[PDB]
Every structure is written in C-alpha cells, then in structure tokens.
Amino acid sequence: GVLYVGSKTKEGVVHGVATVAEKTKEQVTNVGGAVVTGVTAVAQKTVEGAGSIAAATGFVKKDQ
Amino acid sequence: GVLYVGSKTKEGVVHGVATVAEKTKEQVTNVGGAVVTGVTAVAQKTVEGAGSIAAATGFVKKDQ
Amino acid sequence: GVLYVGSKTKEGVVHGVATVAEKTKEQVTNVGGAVVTGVTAVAQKTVEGAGSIAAATGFVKKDQ
Amino acid sequence: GVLYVGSKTKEGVVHGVATVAEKTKEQVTNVGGAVVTGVTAVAQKTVEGAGSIAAATGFVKKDQ
Amino acid sequence: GVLYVGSKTKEGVVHGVATVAEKTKEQVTNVGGAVVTGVTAVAQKTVEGAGSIAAATGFVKKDQ
Amino acid sequence: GVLYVGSKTKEGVVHGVATVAEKTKEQVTNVGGAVVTGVTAVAQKTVEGAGSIAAATGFVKKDQ
Amino acid sequence: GVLYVGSKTKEGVVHGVATVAEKTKEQVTNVGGAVVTGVTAVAQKTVEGAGSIAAATGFVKKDQ
Amino acid sequence: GVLYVGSKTKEGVVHGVATVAEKTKEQVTNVGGAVVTGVTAVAQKTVEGAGSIAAATGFVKKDQ
Amino acid sequence: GVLYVGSKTKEGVVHGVATVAEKTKEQVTNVGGAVVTGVTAVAQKTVEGAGSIAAATGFVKKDQ
Amino acid sequence: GVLYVGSKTKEGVVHGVATVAEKTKEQVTNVGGAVVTGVTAVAQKTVEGAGSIAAATGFVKKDQ
Amino acid sequence: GVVAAAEKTKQGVAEAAGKTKEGVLYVGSKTKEGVVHGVATVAEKTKEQVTNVGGAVVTGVTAVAQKTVEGAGSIAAATG
C-alpha cells in the first residue's frame, strides 16, 4: 500500500504578497468605463465541469 | 491499505497577504462606471457542476 | 508500494510578490475604456472541463 | 516500488517578483481604448480540457 | 524501483524579476487603441487539450 | 532501477530579469494602433494538444 | 540502471537580462500601426502538437 | 548502466544580455507600419510537431 | 556503460551580448513599411517536425 | 564504455557581441520598404525536419 | 510655522503638523528562533541504548532558546 509520511502538496495556491505605498498621489476621472488600481489575489482549482468564475472586479457589462 | 501519517494537502488556498498604505492621497470622480482600489483575496474549489461565481465586486450590469 | 517521505509538490502556484511605490504621482482621465494600474496575482489549476475564468478585472464588455 | 525522499517539483509556478517606483510621474488620457501599467503575475496548469482563461485585465470587447 | 532522493524539477516557471523606475516622466494619449507599459510575468503548463489562454492584458477586440 | 540523487532539471524557464530606468522622458500619441513599452517575461511548456496562448498584450484585433 | 548524481539540464531557458536607461528622451506618434520599445523575454518548450503561441505583443490584426 | 555525475546540458538557451542607453534622443512617426526598437530575448525548443510561434512583436497583419 | 563526469554541452545557445548607446540622435518617418533598430537575441533548437518560427518582429504582412 | 571527463561541446552558438555608438546622428524616411539598423544575434540547431525559421525582422511581405 | 489652507472647494482637507516622529510597524511578519520542523522517519527495527554514569546526556528532537543575562548557559554540562 501507499505511504505518505510528512508529505506536502500545493495545487492552485497563492502565497506571500506584500505591498507598500508611501506618500503617493492619485487622481482619477472616470466616465462609463472601468478603472482598477488595487491588490488582487485569486486562486482557483476546478476538478471538472464548466462556467466557474472565481473573481470579477471593476467591470462594466452592457450586453444587448 | 493506504497510510497518511503527518501528511498535508492544500487545494485552492490563498495565504499571506500583507498591505500597507502610509500618507497616501486619492481623489476619485466616477460617473456610471466602476472603480476598484481595495485588497481582494478569493479562493475557490469546485468538484463538479457549473455556474459558480465565488466573488463579484465593483460592477455595473445593464443588460437588455 | 509507493512511499512519499518528506516530498513536496507545487502545481499552479504564485509565491513572493513584493511592490513598493514612494512619492509617485498619477493622473488618469478615462472615457468608456479600461485603465488598470494595480498588483494582480492569479493562480489556476484545472483537471478537466472548460469555460473556467479565474479572474477578470478592469474590462468593458458591450456585445451585440 | 517508487520512493520519493525529500523530492521537490514545480509546474506552472511564478516566484520572486520585486518592483519599485520612486518619484515617478504619469499622465494618461484614454478614450474608448485600453491602457495597462501595473504588475501582473499569472500561473496556470491545465491537465486537459479547453476554454480556460486564467486572467484577463484591461480589455475592451465590443463583438457584433 | 525508481528512487528520487533530493531531486528538483522545474517546468514552466518564471523566477526573479526585478524592476526599478526613479524620477521617470510618462505622458500618454490613446484613442481607441492599446497601450501597455507595465511588468508582466506569466507561466503556463498544459498537459493536453486546447484553447487555454493564460493571460490577456491591454487589448481591444471588435470582431464582426 | 533509476536513481536521481541531487539532480536538477529546467524546462521552459525564465530567470533573472533586471531593469532600471532613471530620469527618462516618454511621450506617446496613439490612434487606433498598439504601443508597448514594458517588461514582459513569459514561460510556456506544452506536452501535447494545440491552441494554447500563454500571453497576449497590447493588441488590436478587428477581424471581419 | 541509470544514475543521475548532481546532474543539471536546461531546455528552453532564458537567464540573465539586464537593461538600463538613463536620461533618455523618446517621442512617438502612431496611427493604426505597431510600435514596440520594451524588454521582452520569452521561453518555450513544446513536446508535441501544434498551434502554440507563447507570446504576442504590440500587434494590429485586421483579417478579412 | 549510464552514470551522470556533475554533468551539465544547455539546449535552446539565451544567457547574458546587457544593454545601456544614456542621453539618447529618439523621434518616431509611424503610419500603418511597424517600428521596433527594444531588447528582445527569445528561446525555443520543440521536440516534434509544427505551428509553434515562440514570440511575435510589432507586426501589422492584414490578410485577405 | 557510458560515464559523464563534469561534462558540458551547448546546442543552440546565445550568450554574452553587450550594447551601449551614448548621446545618439535618431529620427524616423515610416509609412506602411518596417523599421527595426533594436537588440534582438534568438536561440532555437528543433529535434524534428516543421513550421516552427522562433521570433518575428517588425513586419508588415498583407497577403491576398 | 565511453568516458567524458571535463569535455565541452558547442554546436550552433553565438557568443561575445559588443557594440558601442557615441554621438551618432541618423535620419531615415521610409515608404513601403524595409530599413534595418540594429544588433541582431541568432543561433539555430535543427536535428531534422523542415520549415523552421529562427528569426525574421524588418520585412514587408505582400504575396498574391 | 507650518500652514495649510483650502478654500472654495466642494470637498476639502487642510492638515498641518510640526515636528513628527514615526514608529516601528510589523505587518504579516514571521520570526523563528530555535525551531525544529518537518522531521519524518520510517524504520522497521529500532534499538536505542543510553548508559550514563555521573555525566550529562541530551538526546532526541530538541529545540532550545536560552537567554542568560549573567552566568553560564549550556545545553549539557558536567562539572566534577
């Protein structure tokens, strides 16, 4: 039989994200559009199937 | 038979996200759009099926 | 049988992302478009299937 | 049988991304287009199947 | 049987990307086009199948 | 049987990319075209199959 | 049997790319074309199959 | 059996590319063409198959 | 059996490319053509098969 | 059996390319043609097969 | 002295400050000192025998973090 002593496994992982912002100046003017300027960390693992969205941020959907 | 002694497994995990913002200035003016500027951490694991949205932030949906 | 003593495995992983911004000035003016200017870390692992979007940020979809 | 003692494996990994921006000035004016100017780290691993988008940022889709 | 003692393997990996920008000035004016000027790190590994896009940034798709 | 003691293997890897820009001035004016001027690091490894795009940045697709 | 003690192998690798730009001035005016002026590092390894594009940047596709 | 003690192998590798640009002035005016003026490092290794493009930058495709 | 102790092999490699440009002035005016004026390093190794393009930069394809 | 102790082999390699340009002035005016004036280093090694282009830069293809 | 002033604004913020001194900050930081982790073993037959006479013996997995301000620190000490 199979033995697993002290074994580690990572699948779809995100680890260690550091960010710093000192004395920064930002000016935005948006009209009917998207503007994104932030930290985003996403991890997904799908065994089977379809139509799985892990994350959706800052979007403008206007389908017809 | 199978033995698992002291074994570890990660699947779809997000770990360790650090952020700092000191003395920052931001000015935003939005009209009918999306603006995102924040920390976002998302983790998903789907065995099967479909149509599974883990997270949706800062969006403007106007379907017809 | 198979033995796994002290074995490690990474599949679809993102690790160690550091960012710093000191005394930076940014001015944006968007009209009906996309502007992205932020840290983004994404990790995916799909065994089978289709139609799996891990992350979607700063977009403008106007299908007809 | 197979033995794995102290063995390591990386597949689809992104590791160690450092960025610094000091005293930088940026001015953007966008009309109905895309402008991207940010750190992006993406890692994917697909065993089988199709139609898997790991990340999509700063886009303008207007299909007919 | 096969033994793997202290063995390492990298497949589709991106490691060690450093960037610095001091006292830089940039001015952009875009109309209905794409402009990209940011760090991008992407890693992919596909065992089989098709139609797998790891990353898509700063694009303008207007199919008919 | 095969032994692998302390053996290393790299396949599709990108490692060590350093960039510096001090006191640089850039002025761009784009109309309905593509302009790219940023660091890009991409690594791919495909065992079999087809139609796999690792990265696509700064493009303007208008098929008919 | 085969032994691999302390053996190294590189296949499709890109390593060590350094770039510096001090006090440089650039002025671009594009109309419906492509202009590229940035660091790009790409590494690919394909065992079999076809239709695999590792990277595509700064292009204007208008097929009919 | 075959022994590999301390053996090294490179296949399709690019290593050591250094570039410097001090006090340079460039002025470009493009109309419906391609202009490329940046560092590009590409490495490919294909065991078998066809239709594999490692990198494509600064192009204008208008097939009929 | 074959022994490989401390043996090295290079196949399709590019190594050591240094470039400097001080106080240079360039003025370009392109109409519907290609102009290339940048460092390019490319390395390929193909065991078998066909239709493998390692790199394509600064081109204008208008087939009929 | 064959022994390889401390043996080196180069096949298809390009090594050591240095370039300097100080106080140079260039003025180009292109119409529907190709102009190339940059460093280019290319290395190829093909075991068998056909139709393998390592690099193509600054070209204008208009087949009928 | 420092002076700040915002006028005729829909949104405004005026901040002024004299002498200032920042402090230490630790966000998401890890520190290990004297730690042992990840020890895996597989055996069929193990025999261990220790025989001590008038001495000091330390054995097994062990982590220590001593901090002796005055005097002698030792893991094992045997002074006759």
Place this chain on the structure above:
Amino acid sequence: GVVAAAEKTKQGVAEAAGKTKEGVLYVGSKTKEGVVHGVATVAEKTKEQVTNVGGAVVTGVTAVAQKTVEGAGSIAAATG
C-alpha cells in the same frame, strides 16, 4: 515656514509639515535563526548506543539560539 494652499477647486487637499522623521517598517518579512527543517530518513535496521562517563554529550536533531550577555555559552561543556 512650509506653506500649502489650494483654492477654487471642486476637490482639494492642502497639506503642510515641518520637520519629519520616518520609522522602521516590516511588511511580509521572514527571519530564521537557529532553525532546522526538512529532515527525512528511511532505514531498515538502526542501532544507536551512547556511553558517557563524567562528560557532556549532545545528540539528535537540535536547534539552539543562545544569547549570553555576560559569561560563557556552550552547547556541551565538561570542566573537571
């Protein structure tokens, strides 16, 4: 003195400051001192025998982080 002033703006921010001194910051930083990790072993028959008389013996996996301000620090010490 420092002076800042914003006028006739829909959004405005005026900040002024005199002497300033920043501090230390640690974000997402790791530090190891005296650490042992990743030790894997496979054996069939193990025999270990230690025989000490009037001495010091240290053995096995061990991590130590000593910091003796005054006096002598030693892992094993045997003074007759």
Place this chain on the structure above:
Amino acid sequence: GVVAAAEKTKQGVAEAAGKTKEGVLYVGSKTKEGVVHGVATVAEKTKEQVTNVGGAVVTGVTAVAQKTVEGAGSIAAATG
C-alpha cells in the same frame, strides 16, 4: 521656505514640506542565520556508537546561533 500652491483646478493637491528624513523599509525580505534545511537519507543498516570520558561531544543535525557579548562562546568545550 517651501511654498506650494494650486489654483483654478477641478482637482488639486498642494503639498509643502521642510526638512524630511526617511526610514528603513523591508518588504518581502528573507534572512537565514544558522539554518539547516533539506537533508535526506536512505540506508539499510546503520550503527552509531559514541564513547565519551570527561570530554564534550556534539553530533547529529545541529543549528546554532550564539551571540555572546562578553565571555567565550563554543559549541563544544572541554577544559581540564
């Protein structure tokens, strides 16, 4: 003195500052001192015998991080 001023703007920011001194910053940095990692072993029959008389003996996997301000630091010391 420093003076900054923004006028007749929809969005404006005026910042002024006198003397300034930045501080240390550590983002995503790693440091190892006295560390042992990645030790793998495979054996069939292992025998280990230690025999100490009036001495110091250190053995096995070991990591140490000593910092003795005054006095003598030693891993193993045997003074008669």
Place this chain on the structure above:
Amino acid sequence: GVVAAAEKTKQGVAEAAGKTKEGVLYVGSKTKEGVVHGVATVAEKTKEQVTNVGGAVVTGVTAVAQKTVEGAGSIAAATG
C-alpha cells in the same frame, strides 16, 4: 526657497520641498549566513564510531552563526 505653482488646470499637483534625505529600502531581498542546504545521501551499510577522552569533538551536519563582541569564539575548544 523652493516654490511650485500650478494654475488654470483641470487636474493639477503642486509639490514643494526643502532639504530631504532618503532612507534604506529592501524589497524582495534574500540573505544567507551560516547555512547548509541540499544534502542527499544513499548508502547500504554505515558504521560510525567516535571515542573522545578529555577533548572536544563536533560532527554531523552543522550550521553556526557566532558573533562574540569580546572574548574568544570557537566551534570546538580543548584547553588543558
């Protein structure tokens, strides 16, 4: 003194500053001192015997990071 001024702009930023001194910054930096990593071994029969009398002996995988400000630092010391 330094003076900055922006007028008649939809977006404007005026910044002014006198004396300034930057500080140290570490982003994504690694440092190893006294480290041992990647040690792999395969054997069939191992025998190890140590026999010490009135001396110092150090053996096995070992990492040390000593920093003695005043006094003598030694891994193994045997003074009669």
Place this chain on the structure above:
Amino acid sequence: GVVAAAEKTKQGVAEAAGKTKEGVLYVGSKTKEGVVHGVATVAEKTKEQVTNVGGAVVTGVTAVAQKTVEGAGSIAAATG
C-alpha cells in the same frame, strides 16, 4: 531658489525641490556568506572512526559565519 510653474494646462504637475540626498536601495538582491549547498553522495559501505585525546576535532558538513570584534576566532583550537 528653485522655481517650477505650469499654467493653462488640462493636466499639469509642478514640482520644485532644494537640496536632496538619495539613499540605498536593494531590489531582488541575494547574498550568501558561509554557505554550503548541493552535496550528493552515493556509497555502499561507509566506515568512519575518530579518536581524539585532549584535542579539538571538527568534521562533517559545516558552515560557519563568525564575527569576533575583539579576541581570537577559530573553528578548532587546542591550547595546552
């Protein structure tokens, strides 16, 4: 003094500064001091015997990073 001024612009930035002094920066830098890595061994029969009397002996894989400000530093020292 330094003076900067932007007028009649849709987007403008005026920055002025007097004396300035930059600082050290480390981005993505690595440093090794006293390190041992990548040691692989394959054997069938190994025998090791050490016999010490009143001396110092150091053996095995070893990494050290000593920094003695005043006094004598030695890996192994045996003074009678």
Place this chain on the structure above:
Amino acid sequence: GVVAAAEKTKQGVAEAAGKTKEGVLYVGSKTKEGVVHGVATVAEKTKEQVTNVGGAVVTGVTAVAQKTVEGAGSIAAATG
C-alpha cells in the same frame, strides 16, 4: 537659480531642482563569499580514520566567513 516653466499645453510637467546627490542602487545583484556548492561523489567502499592528540583538525565540506576586527583569526590553531 534653476527655473522651469511650461505654458499653453494640454499636458505639461515643470520640474526644477537645486543641488542633488544620488545614492547606491542594487537591482537583481548576487554576491557569494565563502561558499561551497555542487559537490557530487560516487564510491563503493569508503574508510576514513582520524587520530588527534593535543592538536587541531578540521575536515569535511566546510565554508567559513570570518571577520575579526582585532585579534588573530584561524581555521585551525594549535598553540602549545
């Protein structure tokens, strides 16, 4: 003094600065001091015997990085 000025521009940037002094920068740089890497061995029968009396002996894979400000530094020292 330095003076910069931009007028009648859709986008403009005016920067002025007096005395300036840049600092050190390290991006993607590596440094090794006292390092040992890549040691591979294959053997069938190994025998090692050391016999020390009142002396210093150092052996095996070893990396050292000593930095003695005042006093004598030595890997092995044996003073009678």
Place this chain on the structure above:
Amino acid sequence: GVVAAAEKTKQGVAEAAGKTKEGVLYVGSKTKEGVVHGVATVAEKTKEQVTNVGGAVVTGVTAVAQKTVEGAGSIAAATG
C-alpha cells in the same frame, strides 16, 4: 542659472537643474570571493588517514573569506 521653457505645445516637459552628482548603480551584477563549485568524483575504494600530534591540519573541500583588520590571519597555524 539654468532655465528651461516650453510653450504652445500639446504635450510639453520643461526640466531644469543646477549642480547634480550621480551615484553607484549595480544591475544584474555577480561577484564571487572564496568560492568552490563544481567538484565531481567517482571512485571504487577510498582510504584516508590523518594523524596529528600538536599541530594544525585542514583538509577536504574548503572555502574561506577572512578579513582581519588588525592581527594575523591564517588558515592553519601551529605556534609552539
């Protein structure tokens, strides 16, 4: 003094500066001091015997990086 001025431009940049002094920069640079790498060996039967009496002996793979400011530095030293 230095003076720069841009007028009647859609995009403009005016920069002026007085005295300036650049600093050191290191991008993608490597440095080795006291390093040993790439040592491969194949043998069938190895015998090693060392016999020291009142002396200093150093052997095996060894890398050292000493930097003694005042006093004598030596790998092996044996003063009677």
Place this chain on the structure above:
Amino acid sequence: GVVAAAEKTKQGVAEAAGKTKEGVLYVGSKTKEGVVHGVATVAEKTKEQVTNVGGAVVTGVTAVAQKTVEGAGSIAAATG
C-alpha cells in the same frame, strides 16, 4: 547660464542643466577572486596519508580570499 527653449511644437521637451557629474554603473558584470571551479576526477583505488607533528598542513580543494589590513596573512604558518 544654460538656456533651452522649445516653442510652437505639438510635442516638445526643453531641458537645461548646469554643472553635472556622472557616477559608476555596472550592468551585467561578473567578478571572480579566489575561486575554484570545474574539478573532475575518476579513480579506482585512492590512498591518502598525512602525518603532522608540530606543523601546519593544508590540503584538498581550497579557495581563500584574505584581506589583512595590518599584520601577517598566511595560508599555513608554523612558527617555533
């Protein structure tokens, strides 16, 4: 003084500067000092015997990088 001026341009850049002094730059540069690399050996039977009495002996693969500011530096030294 230096004067630069651009007028009536769609894109313009005016830069002016007084005294200027550049600094050192290192891009993609390598440096080795005291290094040993690429040593391969194949043997069937190896015998090595060292016998030291009251002397200094250094042997094996060795890399050293000494930098003694005041005092005598030596790899091996034996003063009676």
Place this chain on the structure above:
Amino acid sequence: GVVAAAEKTKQGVAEAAGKTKEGVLYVGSKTKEGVVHGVATVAEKTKEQVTNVGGAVVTGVTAVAQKTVEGAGSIAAATG
C-alpha cells in the same frame, strides 16, 4: 552661455548644458583574479603521502587572493 532653441516644429527637443563630466561604465565585463578552472584527471591507482615536522605545507588545488596593506603575505611560511 550655452543656448539651444527649436521653433515651429511638430516634434522638437531643445537641450542645453554647461560643464559636464562623465563617469565609469561597465557593461557585460568579466574579471578573474586568482582563479583555477577546468582540471580533469583520470587515474587507476593514486598514492599520496605527506610528512611534515615543524614546517608549513600547502597542497592540492588552491586559489588565493591576498591583499595585505601592511605586513608580510605568504602562502606558506615557516619561521624558526
């Protein structure tokens, strides 16, 4: 003084500068000092014997890079 001026241009650049002094630059440069590389050997039977009494002996592959500011530097020194 220096004067530059561009007028009535779609794209223009005016640069002016007074005194200027360039600095050192190193791009893609290599330097070796005290290095040994590429040593290959094949043998069947090797015997090596060293016998030292009250002297200095250095042997094997060796690379050194000494830099003694004041005092005597020697690889091997034996002063009675």
Place this chain on the structure above:
Amino acid sequence: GVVAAAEKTKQGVAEAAGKTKEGVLYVGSKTKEGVVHGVATVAEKTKEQVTNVGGAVVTGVTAVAQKTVEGAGSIAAATG
C-alpha cells in the same frame, strides 16, 4: 558661447553644450590575472611523497594574486 538653433522643421533637435569631459567605458571586456585553466591528465599509477622539516613547501595546481602595499610578499618563505 555655443549656440544651436533649428527652425521651420517637422522634426528638429537643437543641442548645445559648453565644456565637456568624457569618461571610461568598458563593454564586453575580459581580464585575467593569476589564473590557471585547462589542465588535463591521464595516468595509470601515480605516487607522490613530500617530506618537509622546518621549511616551506607549496605544490599542486595553484593560482595566486597578491598585492602587498608595504612589506614582503612571497609564495613560500622560510626564514631561520
């Protein structure tokens, strides 16, 4: 003084400069000092014997790069 001027051009560049002094530049340059490379040997039976009494002996592959500012530099020195 120097004067440059471009007028009525679609693209123009006017540059002017006073006193100027260039600096050293090294692109793709190599330098070796005290180096040994490419040493290959094949033998069947090798015997080496060294017997030193109160002297200095250096042997084997050796590279040295000494730089003694004041005092005597020697590879081997034996002063009675």
